[PDB]
Symmetry: C5
Subunit: 340 residues, 5 copies
Amino acid sequence: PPSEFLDKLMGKVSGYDARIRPNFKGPPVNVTCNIFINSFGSIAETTMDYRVNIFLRQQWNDPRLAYSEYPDDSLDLDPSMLDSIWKPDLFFANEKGANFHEVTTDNKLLRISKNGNVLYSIRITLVLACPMDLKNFPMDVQTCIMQLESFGYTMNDLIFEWDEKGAVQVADGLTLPQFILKEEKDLRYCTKHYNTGKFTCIEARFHLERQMGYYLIQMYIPSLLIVILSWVSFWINMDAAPARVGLGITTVLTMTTQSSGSRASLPKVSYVKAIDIWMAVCLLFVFSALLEYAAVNFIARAGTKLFISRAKRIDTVSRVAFPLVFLIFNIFYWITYKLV
Amino acid sequence: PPSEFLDKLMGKVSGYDARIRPNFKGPPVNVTCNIFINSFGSIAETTMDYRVNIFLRQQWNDPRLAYSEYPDDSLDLDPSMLDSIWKPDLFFANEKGANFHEVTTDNKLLRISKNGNVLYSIRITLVLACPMDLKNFPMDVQTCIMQLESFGYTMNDLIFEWDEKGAVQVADGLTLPQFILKEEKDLRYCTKHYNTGKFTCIEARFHLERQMGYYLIQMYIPSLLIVILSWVSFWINMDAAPARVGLGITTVLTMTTQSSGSRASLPKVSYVKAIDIWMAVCLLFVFSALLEYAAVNFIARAGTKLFISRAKRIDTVSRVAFPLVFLIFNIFYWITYKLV
Amino acid sequence: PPSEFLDKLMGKVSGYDARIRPNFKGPPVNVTCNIFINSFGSIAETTMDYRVNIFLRQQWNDPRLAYSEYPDDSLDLDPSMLDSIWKPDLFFANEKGANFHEVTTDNKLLRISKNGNVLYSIRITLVLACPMDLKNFPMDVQTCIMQLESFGYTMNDLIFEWDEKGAVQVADGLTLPQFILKEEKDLRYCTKHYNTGKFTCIEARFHLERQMGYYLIQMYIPSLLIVILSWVSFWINMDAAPARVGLGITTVLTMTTQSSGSRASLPKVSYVKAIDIWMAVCLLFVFSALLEYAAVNFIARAGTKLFISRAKRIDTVSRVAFPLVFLIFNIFYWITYKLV
Amino acid sequence: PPSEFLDKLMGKVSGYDARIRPNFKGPPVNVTCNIFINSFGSIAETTMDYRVNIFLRQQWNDPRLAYSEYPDDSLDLDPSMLDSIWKPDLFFANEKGANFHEVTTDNKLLRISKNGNVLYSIRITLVLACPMDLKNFPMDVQTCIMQLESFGYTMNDLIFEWDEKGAVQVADGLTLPQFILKEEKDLRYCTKHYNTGKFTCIEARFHLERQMGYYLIQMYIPSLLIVILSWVSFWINMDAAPARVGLGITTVLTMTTQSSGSRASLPKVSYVKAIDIWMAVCLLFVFSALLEYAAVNFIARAGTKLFISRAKRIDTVSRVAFPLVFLIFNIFYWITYKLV
Amino acid sequence: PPSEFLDKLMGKVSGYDARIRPNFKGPPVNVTCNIFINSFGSIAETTMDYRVNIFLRQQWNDPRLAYSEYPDDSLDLDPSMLDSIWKPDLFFANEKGANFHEVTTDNKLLRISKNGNVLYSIRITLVLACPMDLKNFPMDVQTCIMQLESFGYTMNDLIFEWDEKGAVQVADGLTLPQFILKEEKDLRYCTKHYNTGKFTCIEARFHLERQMGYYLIQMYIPSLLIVILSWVSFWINMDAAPARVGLGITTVLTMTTQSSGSRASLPKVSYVKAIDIWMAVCLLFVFSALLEYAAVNFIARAGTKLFISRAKRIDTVSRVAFPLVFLIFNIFYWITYKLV
Ligand SMILES: *[C@@H]1O[C@H](CO)[C@@H](O[C@@H]2O[C@H](CO)[C@@H](O)[C@H](O)[C@H]2NC(C)=O)[C@H](O)[C@H]1NC(C)=O
Ligand SMILES: *[C@@H]1O[C@H](CO)[C@@H](O[C@@H]2O[C@H](CO)[C@@H](O)[C@H](O)[C@H]2NC(C)=O)[C@H](O)[C@H]1NC(C)=O
Ligand SMILES: *[C@@H]1O[C@H](CO)[C@@H](O[C@@H]2O[C@H](CO)[C@@H](O)[C@H](O)[C@H]2NC(C)=O)[C@H](O)[C@H]1NC(C)=O
Ligand SMILES: *[C@@H]1O[C@H](CO)[C@@H](O[C@@H]2O[C@H](CO)[C@@H](O)[C@H](O)[C@H]2NC(C)=O)[C@H](O)[C@H]1NC(C)=O
Ligand SMILES: *[C@@H]1O[C@H](CO)[C@@H](O[C@@H]2O[C@H](CO)[C@@H](O)[C@H](O)[C@H]2NC(C)=O)[C@H](O)[C@H]1NC(C)=O
Ligand SMILES: [Cl-]
Ligand SMILES: [Cl-]
Ligand SMILES: [Cl-]
């Protein structure tokens, strides 16, 4: 008596057609759809995508499924019979591969109300493409989106829109190894315009922000300490070559070991990012110290009072000058990549 | 005569409906379910998940499957006919992908008792999501959970609960490369509250604890020895520059090679973890030794008895002072990350 | 009334045969096909392939599907019934694995016009093979192609050709971590000639160009600075051994650390590429400096005015000579790998 | 006439039931099963498993398949009809995922003899779990097993046992990158005892032994040479600081580069293994040399004949003493990890 | 009229049996099969296998498919009906996993001639196992094979043999990152001998040869230059300790950085290969230089004319002697691993 009523309502007896939309040749059916995120993030810059495991619930009205000769309000449909009912041809416009779940029971749910409203909730795993710009690495902000588009019905037939109360929700307690999923989501429309017509799609923009604290005390702070070690070489008496050449070349070797050793941890983009500018300029100052003494030793190597006054003068200017240049670069750097 | 009785009991003749729950419009069916773990652990911080291969056994009562005209107690059902019987819509609320096993025979088992009790044991492989907080790395304790939730039946229809005697069991002899699976499991309820209603779920919490002994004698001990090597530089006569500058800068280069060389082994989280604080402070002391001599050489470089007494005094304070500071940090560190 | 007309037109009543081509034993059917690229690039030199997610639309004429007793022009066909219609046996001649998409609905679309024209749009994910020549790395240009070939029909039966207006389109906003997808695509024919006959195929050539800016300020610039550091060793007075031997051997160790440290980032090809020539020659000059002083110290070590004039002369030639040789190599290098 | 006899023998006419075991309510059916290994080894300590591609042949007796009205002895069954015959519910108790092979034909084989004997040979690919203990790395011996267990039939119904002549065979010419598959296999029983009853399983134990010769001349020999380089520092006159401090600290830096450079090659276990003890003790001796001179320079730095006799005495003891300590550790090490 | 003749010839009307071989109880059917290679090579020493994407065409004679009442010669069969015809049970004896292709149409082709000849061409992707011996790395030659074996028919029923004109072909333009696919293929028989009987198989041997040019100018040449840098230490006056100890220990540190830095690029085999012998002996000579001076300084440290003549004599022998030993090893090495 429960399940032999859906065969009466969608079988060969009644004239329900599974591949004809509700309100056919009439108003476009409204689909109120909302997303719950269970798991989030296998965020990779190698393939420029991420993964998300969602419950997708989508609700519409099918007037040829209304009924009154059955006692309760809601009447659910078995997941093996979902080819017997109309469903929207929703797909995800930026997916790179996705699947259902079928463990211990097929994880699908459809529920027809007494009104004729249909609630359809599924649980799917998604590999969604979001392009990334790592020009501001590590202090970069990513925006990975999630588009929901009709595949074959235009907006004169099918209209997608978000739920009013809460569209996208995220299960609390999730943790990303790189990013922080911002709590404010950005719901937008993305309505497609092709020669076939206007196709509906609605997008959810997720804001990601990279944590920087590892790259501070593993890349930035040790390089800044090595630059200070090259600044030590200016408070040393001249013509003492092996205690000032060896210091200045050892800071070069330690900066080179710092930059090359930190190469396998940073991503494999092949363009200039904001940590490579720090390593490059912090190499140019450490190199600039030994190049400075390479000038000073040749100036004072000839031998003249002007030569010691000229050598002393160069050191006097240099001792003060290079922390000022590193301070101007140090202000312009963090304003440029951090402030904006 | 054995298998032609289940067709008599669940066929077109008898009125058994496969998608109507037992005790329909009555009490919620109890599901006594328990888990045996065969394999455990492909634990990854990159995707924040693990893998587990389980036998899931779940037992319930179906009163419209009781019988008396068959000689033995237990009557098993073929795995090809499992669509002919009601099964709970159990799913795992934190899975990221999961599958059955079908090699040489589909690894499913259903057994209907003479009482009407149904035993249903399957063998499935799971990729379950557990978020991790590596702030206390390596001396961190993880808690990876395992939730068992009804998908479409509320608690007025279906109730999950663990077995009384032993719910979760783990096959002895398993070994993880990183963690130690604790023998005490934490069985809890997790009962979900949605606008549809209260959905049953039961969770098993597994406690994991990371082994640290590699990071002692490969990261902690060599860094502590390099800090002692920077402490050697204080028991050296002053104005002997290349035997004390070169020592102090070589300890910097060896600490930098130690920290950058140990970078590819540690995980790829982008925030401050407890081994990065050890490498950072053990870099600040080794740097602080050469910065200390960079003060001492300029104090004693001018030339005055006060200058040698002032230089000697600084060395006298420093020789004693830096093992005290490393001892205070060394107590606060291991209490802070190890004791709590 | 909509969907019971396609059963009238392609069912057992009408004599439509699904595996007989249109215009059978007549003219070859024209297939106007065009490609829209959603996602592009998991470009790997390890397996010599890439990935692309496309909409493939292909249009042909089937004269035994024309109709007039139905009100509208276009009449769409359900994706479950696509075995009931003829489709071209198009495959991709350089694929290494590929699949469809079926999430929330099978992502296929077929539309029969009143004229008898059939539009067939699908959405498939592709792993396409393109062989790469990394001899000019990093300043190399790749050309990865995309072939569309008939599988069993010769050109006397089936002819593929691109759409006139726009054949290949790429969704704007895509970003590759290594390359830049050039905006000018190269549409060609590739017509196959076998003993069975001439098989149609049409190819789209995509031009990729590698970004170099990382390898400038991480590989090229630090090596050039180390070569300048070996040039510093010539403006030093002779017979001062430990300040000139230790400098020259420390530049060797820093160049060796630069070359070996940059090894895990560059690809795993086992042949000579254009960055290995830079690292090799920038090792031969840094080695050539200490080998030069290894000559100079033995010339001036014996003791004669000719010996100091001969030593001074060698330094005089060397001080000027090695930046000229590095300038000739530096012109020939960037013309040879960058200009052509 | 060949294939229309199996439809006579297992069809709707004859009373063969596919899901009722032979000799039902009688003796347990014997399954003589044997394994041929084609490929072996994707041995990973990350997931604690390996892969093996086998032919599994299993033979049993089915008395209701005996026949006499057909000319030849053996009568084979088509792989599409294997649901029409009883098969054992064998599974592998330590698999983590496994599949069949179906390329160009489904790779299954069943052959019914005139006696009623059934031979069933399949070809399957296996990911089998074996836990590993890398405490003795590299000179460790692993034992990876392979269990064959009935899934739903107890030992009162089904009994597995190996073939007498040769149970497990391995195709000659296989090569592992890490291990050596020992030629002596260890056939055992593993009979399971559950509350349902005794379930049959038979296991094959494979003995693996790791090759060590890479870790000799890449980890052990260079570290031993660096320890000898620290032993060089004792045959040097005292108060010659920069030629003995710089040697002793350069051996520390070279040992640190050796240990940190060899870190990415060794596995990612997080506990103390036998190569980490070698690197740790070979770091403690190289550190102990400079700590020894850090004592000697302070003893002889004050100035007294007793001080030079005390300094000379310390060197005299140390010159002899540290190769004896490294010899005692060098005997205890290789006996402890290599002999047992 | 085209496709309703194959139903007349292989349907329920005619007595064609799909699982009975042609010429049953007669001569063994000949299968003339040939292979075209589209893509080749995901060659991995970790799993000891490679990948290849082939067209497999196989031709045989089926005398109960000959016809004369149809106008043309060739009559093709639909890929959905391939279970209606006999096909050989060919499989690949060294595959580790393999699949078909089904994109836009199932990529299979069968064509029945008027003679009764059947042509069957498919397109499959293969992971084929070839064991590798990296003892001669990098100058090693691999031989990866490809076996085609009958699964259930002996040689009294089915015989495989290659095509006469061209059996294996490779699509031009392919590029491997490591190897060079040799143009001369080695076609062989491999006929299997089991207790069931003789099973046919035919194999194609592919010869691979590794390119070495990367390992020359990245591993061999820099190590040889460091050995020359240790040869520089012999043309230096004795009793000049810090300019000859520091040189000789810096060559040790640079050789250690060269060997440990080149470790992550070379494969993960755990046995002695031919580049590890080069790095080991090039470490023993660089170590042997400082050990030589560690003898010389103790000989000349005591003080005697014999001591300076003995010291000078040792240097005199050593200056000449070590390039001779490196020349003997350098001849024996390249003859031993390169010539044979
Ligand atoms: C889906 O939503 C749209 C938007 O409200 C509905 O279209 C409106 O229908 C009312 C009828 O009272 C008109 O007054 C509006 O002008 C329509 N808005 C449009 C066309 O943008 C549409 O009816 C809804 N679909 C269904 C099946 O009810
Ligand atoms: C599942 O377990 C619950 C909990 O015991 C059962 O509900 C109880 O039924 C008894 C009837 O004697 C009542 O007295 C209790 O108040 C009920 N507890 C509740 C509602 O929390 C329920 O009957 C069981 N299901 C079945 C099918 O027996
Ligand atoms: C597919 O395109 C070809 C190329 O136009 C068509 O073949 C031509 O048919 C016209 C008939 O008016 C001839 O004059 C040309 O010589 C043909 N060109 C050839 C054979 O290269 C073909 O008819 C088209 N297919 C269909 C079904 O219309
Ligand atoms: C499977 O093997 C067992 C072991 O031989 C058989 O059981 C034996 O049957 C003989 C009958 O002559 C008894 O004497 C033994 O005591 C039995 N051994 C036991 C029960 O351990 C069994 O019959 C075999 N199965 C079949 C179908 O023949
Ligand atoms: C497959 O090839 C074999 C080898 O030629 C054929 O066997 C031969 O048949 C001729 C008949 O004229 C004999 O003279 C040879 O001695 C046979 N050679 C053998 C048995 O090795 C066989 O007939 C072929 N199969 C078919 C179906 O024609
Ligand atoms: Cl150094
Ligand atoms: Cl280094
Ligand atoms: Cl590294």
